[PDB]
From TrEMBL, chain A:
The chain holds residues 266 to 315 of 317 of the full protein. Coiled coil: none annotated. It comes from Polytomella sp. Pringsheim 198.80. It is found in: Mitochondrion inner membrane. This is F-ATPase gamma subunit. Belongs to the ATPase gamma chain family.
From TrEMBL, chain B:
It comes from the Eukaryota. One of its GO terms (cellular component) is proton-transporting ATP synthase complex. It comes from Polytomella sp. Pringsheim 198.80. Belongs to the ATPase alpha/beta chains family. Mg(2+) 3 binds at residues 91, 184-185. The keyword Magnesium does not apply. This is ATP synthase subunit alpha. The chain holds residues 142 to 562 of 562 of the full protein. Mitochondrial membrane ATP synthase (F(1)F(0) ATP synthase or Complex V) produces ATP from ADP in the presence of a proton gradient across the membrane which is generated by electron transport complexes of the respiratory chain. F-type ATPases consist of two structural domains, F(1) - containing the extramembraneous catalytic core, and F(0) - containing the membrane proton channel, linked together by a central stalk and a peripheral stalk. During catalysis, ATP synthesis in the catalytic domain of F(1) is coupled via a rotary mechanism of the central stalk subunits to proton translocation.
TrEMBL record, chain C:
Its EC number is 7.1.2.2. This is ATP synthase subunit beta. The keyword Ion transport applies. InterPro entries: AAA+_ATPase, ATP-synt_VA_C, ATP_synth_F1_bsu, ATPase_a/bsu_AS, ATPase_alpha/beta_chains, ATPase_F1/V1/A1_a/bsu_N, ATPase_F1/V1/A1_a/bsu_N_sf, ATPase_F1/V1/A1_a/bsu_nucl-bd. The keyword rRNA-binding does not apply.
From TrEMBL, chain D:
The gene is atp1. Mg(2+) 3 binds at residues 44-45. This is ATP synthase subunit alpha. Mitochondrial membrane ATP synthase (F(1)F(0) ATP synthase or Complex V) produces ATP from ADP in the presence of a proton gradient across the membrane which is generated by electron transport complexes of the respiratory chain. F-type ATPases consist of two structural domains, F(1) - containing the extramembraneous catalytic core, and F(0) - containing the membrane proton channel, linked together by a central stalk and a peripheral stalk. During catalysis, ATP synthesis in the catalytic domain of F(1) is coupled via a rotary mechanism of the central stalk subunits to proton translocation. Produces ATP from ADP in the presence of a proton gradient across the membrane. ATP binds at residue 137. It comes from Polytomella sp. Pringsheim 198.80.
Length: 50, 421, 542, 141, 53
């Protein structure tokens, strides 16, 4: 029991490190899209006035 | 300053005098060999041929890559995307195609030769110079035009260098000959077009790209067509290259060119650093237009190869790494690893198609099951060398593994000295 | 003659401004530019003031000079309509591009209309079976409704819309219309050659028996052509609906290219951009076009439209606006396609107004809601199965996982148009065979069979016949040792005389590309035009 | 339909007709509130009125804001929904109750028009697409 | 929010009393200045508020 839990939790750190590595890139794409989105909202509001 | 109009729309010199020449994005040569002599000027912005002007893609374009010509087969007139991360073998696939056309042009007749054009958008000028030395020491430069708008060139020059190189490639398509155009780093051109669009104060869209950045690539790639028989029957095959960031293929420019081209060659970054080169993602890379335009015999034996590699990806990363081992599908794990090692290939060495299908017939039938996985690249190199060269002339000329040929193939494949074992 | 002729004021890409001295054309009126290389049709979009109109070109504007004579036609873009357009390919402005001669028009109809009114709307929810298991069960199609296929560049929206042409257009009694809007010109030639051998399109004297009209505004065209070729495709379909009284099929391969091409011109019309970068008139341009595609009291249009989601983003404003204009949405998923399940339809994102127990019967409705129940329950466990495996689930939830892993293979189906590149033949599944087949996996009648037996089979008969083939074949490892003996003197000659019976092809040195080449003399110095228009070299000043 | 009025500015109508149809329908429903009767108004797709109002203001060249909406798009819905009241006995005692409908994108409650009408209206009826496919119909969270 | 504060500032200064000023949603003071900010001719700051937030 202790030695199959030692292997089932190595497969859980590998699964929660692949899930974390994939969700970091998903955040980084959503981070880069966010700074691009509100900046376009500022230029579109400034080009309407300038 | 005084601006003079030249009288004509933006044009590049096209013709037989462009072969062998390194060219910027506007037409004037940069290799220092004098002006273009046997040449004439045509527009860089031509409307693509319509529906009646095209016909179905029937003839195969052999890349010389084993993982391409077996799994993702490419016909003349197709647009095939090479997509992947940085340093995953994008050019390793594109410049093996240009080198392999030099080997094939010396054996096919005059009207079956393929003339290549390589457009380098936003590259280093040193890597362009190291590529012309490769095309000269191979002899591929005789059939190759080289268009190069490097990273120091202006953004309208990088915008226009695909259209300049396509018009130089549309000379061969419109005259019944066959062309092969490669837009290295397709995304780059869109970054250079994003620069011109934002400096023209045009409203940016998604990822600050303009609204006509789809039309930037759709207009360019629709000019790669297989023409009908009343238009010479010539073709133009495109290989756009798109670099993805962290393997994300749901990007704006990446999904743009996927919805333009016919198939894709996904080069995975995980297989490239695990030694599997070319790192062709076999599950995601498709080609549904050049599948009908495949070499028969190769079509006979790679139907088994991608079917065995399909169930090999069912044993992917949980062989015993996930929970346990069953030891009944141990056979497919020790065969999919053999078909993986079969498709690995060194750089700048493209293989003729008649010698590729014998190396897959040696692997998919089971003539290398005794060979351990460490020495399969040595085994198949010993297969082509020790099997007599008369069988490659039969398979090339008949165009298929005839029932007379697989008897003599299986006779010649049992008398080869495989290393180890 | 000087009046009713404007001159080109300014050219910004596909957007041309024309100044009319005497009288201005109406908005949506079509114009003609004199002396262009092709037939350049401008369509008036805005009155800009100071006697200038703002127009969108239907072809390329390269070669336009700012004095060119532009003639007003006094009408919008008028295209040929009628039964004479059957078996013909038209472009955006109604010209025949199939090289079969002129189009024998019953009438010349404008491409711009109002939507049919509220009193001319029909409320008849009748099912249209497609033979597709994920479509006929979970999001059934209305016989006279609008149908969307939402997709993310490579998920299979065109293979699905070609299978719908393969399945419901042959069984239809009316006329089909294909509006190819902003798609690959290779696919427009593929569909044309497939419809000629199938007898859907006949050429020459038999042209009157054709059942399909192709309208093609593909992705090699400028954005003015791709923004109005959907309106050309409706006008052929609106004639068969209104005048002929027929039941029309309208297939619009990617309607998103109508929205995208209106955003490429809106940057140059001087508008402030809306959200992510589309035009401010997104909902009223799409709503003006989609409201003309209806079943009226004198005819039905069964429209199947493909919708491209731009970066696999369903929250993008151009797919999100299209969701409200449809009766049945079929959202295709990139992640379902990576599992190999084809068609890659998301069962928890595809909806239909027909999935109602008072329309399709309570027996068909209760199965679809039971299939969606265990597929949602499998999605709720998707991260527990990821980070902890299936060994941590309950024994009543491992039955939920195994059944939902079976039906998402059983929603997969081979197509008759995918048999060319997959090898497996297509399967048409009847409606009653789908409801009975999905009762058995929900109740537990097929817990004996493996998961992969359900993959890419037509009926519940075919999963039992594949479960046998998966266990005859693992017993076929012990079957026999195949020896090929005593054949060398039967019919196979040799290797060496096999080389002597090949035909050597003459390899030609000196490739000879100087044949039929004229080679105009390009000199060193840049040839320019002086003030008198002559070709002179550059002067020696900077 | 004996007790129901239907105001329908559809998708083919102009953008100032869809912008004005919640106010056109509220004025018809204010007849019953101001005469001692009881009204019930449903502004179905109030997320589509703000898109129609955004089209007018962007084409009147008013400067855009969050998701290119006008700055006064809160006042577009706050002055509309505050007309739904329960009047006093000296004004007849009549009432008018509103059911605005806002469509979110992938469950994003944090959207701009969504968070405005949440702060304007009294209650919320949240309908989740994952409770909808578990058999819970209506999918009330 | 300045009208009710002026009543609270009279009870503090002139009456000398202790005042309780309850302001329900001072966010709506900042939101209402944002609804007129682009019409006063100010280019917008961060998320969509006025530059003078
Ligand atoms: N089949 C192969 N076998 C061995 N090495 C290879 C193979 N294909 C490519 N390489 C090597 O991998 C490296 C990647 O270079 P390459 O130009 O092919 O990548 P790339 O994707 O074009 O990179 P970049 O984004 O920098 O342009 C090079 O060192 C190249 O020699
Ligand atoms: N029904 C299907 N069966 C098998 N493979 C399919 C199917 N539909 C799509 N595919 C795969 O996905 C690809 C999508 O091609 P296509 O439908 O033309 O793309 P898009 O959806 O961008 O129009 C095909 O080339 C094929 O590899
Ligand atoms: Mg490179
Ligand atoms: Mg498509």
């Amino acid at each position: 029991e202790h030695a199959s839990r030692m292997s089932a939790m190595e497969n859980s750190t590998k699964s929660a490190g692949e899930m974390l590595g994939k969700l970091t890139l998903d955040y980084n794409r959503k981070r880069q899209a966010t700074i691009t989105t509100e900046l376009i909202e500022i230029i579109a509001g400034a080009s309407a006035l300038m | 300053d005084l601006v003079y109009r030249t009288g004509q729309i933006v044009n590049v010199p096209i013709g037989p005098g462009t072969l062998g020449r390194v060219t910027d994005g506007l037409g004037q040569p940069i290799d220092g060999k004098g002006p273009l002599t046997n040449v004439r000027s045509s527009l860089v912005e031509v409307k693509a041929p319509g529906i009646i002007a095209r016909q179905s893609v029937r003839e195969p374009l052999f890349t010389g890559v084993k993982a391409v010509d077996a799994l993702v087969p490419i016909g003349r007139g197709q647009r095939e995307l090479i997509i992947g991360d940085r340093q995953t073998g994008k050019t390793a696939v594109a410049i093996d195609a240009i080198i392999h056309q030099k080997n094939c042009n010396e054996q096919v007749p005059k009207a079956q030769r393929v003339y290549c054009v390589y457009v380098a958008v936003g590259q280093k000028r040193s890597t362009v110079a190291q590529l012309v030395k490769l095309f000269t020491q191979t002899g591929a430069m005789r059939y190759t035009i080289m268009v190069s708008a490097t990273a120091s060139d202006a953004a309208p020059l990088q915008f226009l260098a695909p259209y300049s190189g396509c018009a130089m490639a549309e000379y061969f398509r419109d005259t019944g000959k066959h062309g092969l155009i490669i837009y290295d780093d397709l995304s780059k051109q869109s970054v250079a077009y994003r620069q011109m669009s934002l400096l023209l104060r045009r409203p940016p869209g998604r990822e600050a790209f303009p609204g006509d950045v789809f039309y930037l690539h759709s207009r360019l790639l629709e000019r790669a067509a297989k023409l009908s028989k009343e238009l010479g029957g010539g073709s133009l095959t495109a290989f756009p290259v798109i670099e993805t960031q962290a393997g994300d293929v749901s990007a704006y420019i990446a999904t743009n060119v996927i919805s333009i081209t016919d198939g894709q060659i996904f080069l995975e970054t995980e297989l490239f650093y695990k030694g599997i080169r070319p790192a062709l993602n076999v599950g995601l890379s498709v080609s549904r237009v050049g599948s009908a335009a495949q070499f028969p015999g190769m079509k006979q034996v790679a139907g088994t190869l991608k079917l065995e590699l399909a169930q090999y990806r069912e044993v992917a990363a949980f062989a015993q790494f996930g929970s346990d081992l069953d030891a009944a599908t141990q056979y497919v794990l020790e065969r999919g690893a053999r078909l993986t090692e079969m498709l690995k290939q060194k750089q700048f060495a493209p293989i003729p198609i008649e010698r590729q299908t014998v190396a897959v017939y040696a692997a998919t039938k089971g003539f290398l099951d005794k060979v351990r996985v460490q020495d399969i690249v040595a085994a198949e190199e010993a297969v082509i060398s020790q099997v007599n060269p008369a069988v490659f002339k039969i398979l090339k000329a008949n165009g298929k593994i005839t029932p007379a040929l697989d008897a003599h193939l299986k006779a010649e494949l049992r008398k080869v000295k495989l290393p180890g074992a | 003659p000087a009046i009713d002729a404007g001159y080109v004021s300014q050219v910004i890409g596909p957007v041309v401004d024309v100044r009319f001295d005497g009288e201005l054309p109406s908005i949506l009126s079509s114009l003609e530019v004199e002396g262009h290389s092709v037939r350049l049709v401008l369509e008036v979009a805005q009155h800009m003031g100071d006697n200038t109109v703002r127009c969108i070109a239907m072809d390329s504007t390269d070669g336009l000079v700012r004095g060119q004579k532009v003639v007003d036609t006094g009408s919008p873009i008028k295209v040929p309509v009628g039964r004479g357009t059957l078996g013909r390919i038209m472009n955006v402005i109604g010209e025949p591009v199939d090289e079969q001669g002129p189009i024998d028009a019953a009438d010349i109809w404008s491409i711009h209309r109002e939507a049919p009114e509220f009193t001319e709307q029909s409320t008849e929810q009748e099912i249209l079976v497609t033979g597709i298991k994920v479509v006929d069960l979970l999001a059934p199609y209305q016989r006279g409704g609008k149908i969307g296929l939402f997709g993310g560049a490579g998920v299979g929206k065109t293979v699905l819309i070609m299978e719908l042409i393969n399945n419901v257009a042959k069984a239809h009694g009316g006329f089909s219309v294909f509006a190819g809007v902003g798609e690959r010109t290779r696919e427009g030639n593929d569909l044309y050659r497939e419809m000629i051998e199938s007898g859907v399109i006949k050429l020459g004297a038999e042209r009157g028996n054709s059942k399909c009209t192709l309208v093609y505004g593909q992705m090699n065209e400028p954005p003015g052509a791709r923004a109005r070729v959907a309106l050309t495709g409706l006008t052929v379909a609106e004639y068969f609906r209104d005048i002929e009284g027929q039941d029309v099929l309208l297939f619009v391969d990617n309607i998103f290219r109508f929205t995208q091409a209106n955003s490429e011109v809106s940057a140059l019309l001087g508008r402030i951009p809306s959200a992510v970068g589309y035009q401010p008139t997104l909902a009223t341009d799409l709503g003006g076009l989609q409201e003309r595609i209806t079943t009226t009291t004198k005819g039905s249009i069964t429209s199947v439209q493909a919708v491209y989601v731009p970066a696999d983003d369903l929250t993008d404003p151009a797919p999100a606006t299209t969701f409200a204009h449809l009766d049945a949405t079929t959202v295709l998923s990139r992640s379902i396609a990576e599992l190999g399940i084809y068609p890659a339809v998301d069962p928890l994102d595809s909806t239909s107004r027909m999935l109602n127990p008072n329309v399709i019967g309570a027996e068909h409705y209760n199965v679809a809601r039971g299939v969606q129940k265990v597929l949602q329950d499998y999605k709720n466990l998707q991260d527990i199965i990821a980070i902890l495996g299936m060994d941590e689930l309950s024994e009543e939830d491992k039955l939920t996982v195994a059944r939902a892993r079976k039906i998402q293979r059983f929603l997969s189906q081979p197509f008759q148009v995918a048999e060319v590149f997959t090898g497996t033949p297509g399967k048409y599944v009847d409606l009653a065979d789908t409801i009975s087949g999905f009762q058995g996996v929900l109740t537990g009648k097929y817990d004996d069979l493996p998961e992969m037996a359900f993959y890419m089979v037509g009926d519940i008969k075919e999963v039992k016949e594949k479960a046998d083939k998966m266990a005859k074949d693992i017993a076929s490892r012990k079957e026999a040792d195949n020896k090929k003996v005593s054949e060398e003197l039967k019919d196979i000659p040799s290797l060496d005389k096999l080389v002597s019976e090949i035909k050597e092809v003459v390899i030609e040195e000196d490739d000879g590309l100087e044949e039929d080449f004229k080679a105009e003399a390009l000199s060193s110095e840049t040839v320019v035009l002086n003030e008198e228009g002559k070709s002179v070299p550059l002067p020696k000043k900077n």
